[PDB]
Design a binder for this molecule. Structure first.
Ligand SMILES: C[C@@H](NC(=O)Nc1ccccc1)C1CC1
Ligand SMILES: C[C@@H](NC(=O)Nc1ccccc1)C1CC1
Ligand SMILES: [Mg+2]
Ligand SMILES: [Mg+2]
Lengths: 546, 546
């Protein structure tokens, strides 16, 4: 029956409420109880505050009017305002104080996940203060989770006037009894109730959500930890840079602040970072999530040598040059992780800091051809299978959905064994035709990978494995160097290809290396444990890249 | 005969040289003359410094080796080094001291403009210092002006070894007598001379350029002020954001630092900002140069109301939301200038600061329909001509090259009179079939506009003029507000459509407005006086947006 949920902002989605601060201010300052609320509300529907809220005047213009109402109220109460009483002051403080009420936001998210239309309905103002950005960020973070954000000052109407409710209902394409509205001001709920809406008066958060659970039939309190926010491909800014005549790089870009270039592995996509991209932007970074060369919407030329590490690296430097970035933080996973260590070794002037998920840094052995080195380890047998051009492309392109559903599996989900793959004759020879769906991915997310890899197939991607000798000779040039820029190695307990123990000597070559470790995490680190990756990257970025 | 010019970096393209600082340091510190040069050069071809320069070790690894050579040199000279002697210290200082030698850079540019292949040949290092970024920026600014930058530490070879010259000649696809090379170290010039190259020993800049003029036959000294750097479309990062189902915005993006969104006028392109984009990036800004809705690679839906200011503004806010920007600086010219004032009035929380070229802010008159207001002024008669859908599109699309060559004209070049255009029956009725080329634009640059406007024509662009009443009613909502965020109005003396006097009352509504004025500048401000625009925007950005 209910099909829409509407949340107030102040005191409902954001806490503390700012009425809360006027109360505290009178007390803290020993003024007559309610005096600041009297100035604030002075003149009711024609007073300064309603003009603010309807968008007629800005917040900076309203400030000196509140001053005057503050004076008039105190003269009529026969008291004085303190020396250096400051309205600007009180409001800035109140506004930077208010944060997102996480449990209310998560209830709004879940309700939207079960198909409610959701909105924010707020009396707010046109903010032209020097410090306006704080609230702009908060409004940005909140709004992306809702169907509509309706602000009094943008629509020229204010709660509790009945016209804003009619605007609300008309925006929601829903009738009043399909609607639940939560607000902390009962006056605000009166007109809503009159049209026949379910309303909930919000004091303490938990009782509100109890009423909201009871009325919607949906579990909202005590629910498990939800996943971080993901990305919808068609809502992203997509960028394209030509690095040389045949070769463009595509990337997805979100956020502002220091550039953070994310480099995915095999056989993956910018979309492998879907859980990190919104968190890192939200943490104050400019995220660039690449399609690496060979993939997705980046160019995939056929020739093997277009994918040696030397060339891949030079082209990532060109990518920075054309975008006008003197540096970026480079964060890589799997093959992208190998690339970022090489960026650190050959272009340290261009890398602000370097982090790898799963891929360790192990210096080339100048006394052993890499083919040799490969044979002395059963787990890398599958790389020999990748060598012969055409062979692995035929198996991996033969059925895309089966390819990704077989690869992308959590550590307890019957991961593909990477074992005597040549002897067996292929990677999938012992896996079902129709694998079940991993818990890590939806069927939609698999079909995004399928659709990406329909553009170029597996030739480019496989070519990354086909420059063993050439990469070896290049890496040998770097054997006298150490990596002395800020560096993070994140190991994944149950990645059985890139095992944590393989990273154990990195401090010999990266003396100030920092570390994280994710337990119970297989090879697909970003989507296996997105919450922990986010926390480890953001904490390292804030201390070492900022 | 000469077809290539090669410039050293230290002491040639960048000044002061760092050998210069070792000299000063000995003196300043009263050490034995040349001692620091002895430590630096210690061991010659096998010493620490040559290993640095060949890329074998990084700058941070070399630092403590120079220390040791500094010690060994002083013990053998029978002196002491001062307390807190610091190599790191001396080099950081020396490196942040060196700037681009502007006159040498401009000679390299001109020589490249007359078709020389140009390069930088430098003994330099892999820089992993905390402060590495300073030099990375300098290297970035220099490199975009040259065909090749060859660094000793990236190629594993050093001047004066003869192999680096052979690598040079092979990179240039030229023989030794087609080559001029300038360096401040004569030892560096010896091997070049042996292969038969013209060489020039660089002490003072002017004598070097005198020798360079004499040898190339090209005037390089005392030449006029060159234009700022422009943009080549296919070297840019191109971005695309979908703001609603039918509508994407394209933009060109360059630089890092605070977001600066550039909004062009009618009938223009992101490319109208080609002279500002590199300067603003170089000044430490993240430039986003839009195709505005209707233009270029942005969507151009047909319906008139898709181009009212309300909708254009909401969609620019969506553009920010999807890119994850809580704010941008908005800088507009002509119609884009009108839009940025409206962004400031309806979304001040999203605009860090606002600047307009030519377009004044004049509050809507709530007592006079805008058609009326239009008739009471002969210069805006041409807007009536724009009203009737189809009419102006036919004239403006009929011959594109003639359209832009007729519009884009400096103030002394027979600008189109915007006079009784309806009565005359069109905008070009009294202009030639084949206009000459304005000094402001090359024939290539005109053909870029032609090719852009072949995608969608003039319907979208003209539609911006077709929402007079709707924009009026919207703007009337804003009549109680003032614009109280940082704001800049730049007037153009000889713009006879948007005259400077039209802006004279802006302080009544924008009390802290800042100003610039460009004399001898017609309507196409960015390309008429690109040098002065750059200087005025960068100075306002650095003081008011930073
Ligand atoms: C060793 C290699 N990673 C790798 O093969 N992952 C992989 C293997 C099989 C299937 C999917 C991914 C690159 C150097 C880091
Ligand atoms: C008045 C209008 N500018 C305008 O028509 N420029 C123009 C006129 C004719 C040809 C090219 C450009 C917009 C509001 C600022
Ligand atoms: Mg409230
Ligand atoms: Mg030199």
């Amino acid at each position: 029956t209910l099909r829409a949920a509407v949340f107030d902002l102040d005191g409902v989605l954001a806490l503390p409420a700012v009425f809360g601060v006027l109360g505290r201010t009178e007390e803290a300052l020993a003024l007559p109880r309610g005096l600041l609320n009297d100035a604030f509300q002075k003149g009711g529907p024609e007073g300064a505050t309603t003009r603010l809220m309807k968008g007629e005047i800005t917040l900076s213009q309203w400030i000196p009017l509140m001053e005057e109402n503050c004076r008039k109220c105190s003269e009529t109460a026969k008291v004085c305002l303190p020396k250096n009483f400051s309205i600007k002051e009180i409001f800035d403080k109140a506004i930077s104080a208010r944060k997102i009420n996480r449990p209310m936001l998560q209830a709004a998210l879940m309700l939207r996940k079960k198909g409610f239309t959701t909105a924010i309905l707020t009396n707010t103002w046109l903010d032209d203060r020097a410090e306006r950005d704080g609230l702009a960020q908060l409004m940005c973070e909140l709004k992306m989770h809702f169907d509509f954000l309706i602000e009094s000052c943008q629509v020229g109407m204010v709660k509790p006037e009945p016209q804003i409710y009619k605007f609300l209902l008309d925006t929601l394409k829903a009738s009043p009894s399909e609607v639940v509205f939560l607000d902390d001001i009962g006056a605000n709920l009166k007109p809503a109730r009159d049209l026949g809406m379910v309303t909930i008066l919000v004091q303490d958060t938990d009782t509100a959500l109890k009423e909201l659970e009871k009325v919607t039939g949906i579990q909202l309190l005590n629910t498990p930890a939800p996943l971080p926010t993901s990305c919808n491909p068609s809502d992203m800014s997509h960028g394209y840079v030509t690095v040389k005549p045949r070769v463009r790089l595509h990337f997805v870009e979100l956020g502002s602040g220091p550039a953070v270039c994310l480099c995915h592995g095999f056989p993956e996509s910018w979309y492998s970072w879907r859980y990190q991209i919104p968190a890192l932007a939200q943490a104050g970074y400019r995220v660039l999530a690449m399609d690496m060369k060979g993939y997705g919407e980046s160019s995939a030329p056929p020739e093997i040598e277009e994918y040696c590490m030397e060339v891949l690296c030079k082209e990532m430097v060109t990518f920075l040059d054309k975008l006008g970035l003197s540096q970026a933080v480079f964060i890589g996973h799997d093959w992208g992780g190998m690339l970022v260590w090489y960026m650190a070794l050959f272009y340290p002037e261009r890398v602000r800091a370097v982090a790898s998920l799963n891929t360790p840094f192990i210096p080339a052995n100048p006394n052993m051809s890499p083919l040799e080195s490969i044979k002395a380890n059963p787990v890398f047998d599958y790389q020999l299978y990748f060598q012969e051009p055409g062979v692995a492309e035929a198996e991996l392109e033969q059925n895309l959905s089966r390819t990704f559903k077989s690869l992308f599996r959590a550590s307890d989900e019957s991961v593909l064994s990477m074992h005597k793959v040549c002897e067996a004759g292929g990677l999938f020879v012992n896996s079902p035709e129709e694998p079940s769906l991993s818990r890590m991915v939806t069927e939609e997310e698999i079909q995004f990978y399928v659709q990406q890899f329909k553009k170029s197939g597996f030739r480019g991607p496989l070519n990354w494995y086909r420059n063993m000798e050439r990469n070896w000779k290049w890496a040998c040039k770097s054997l006298g160097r150490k990596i002395l820029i800020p560096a993070l190695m994140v190991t994944a307990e149950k990645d059985f290809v890139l095992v944590p123990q393989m990273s154990q000597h990195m401090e010999d070559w990266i003396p100030h290396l920092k570390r994280g470790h994710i337990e119970d995490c297989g090879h697909w680190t970003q989507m296996d444990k997105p919450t922990e990756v986010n926390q480890i990257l953001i904490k390292w970025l804030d201390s070492d890249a900022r």
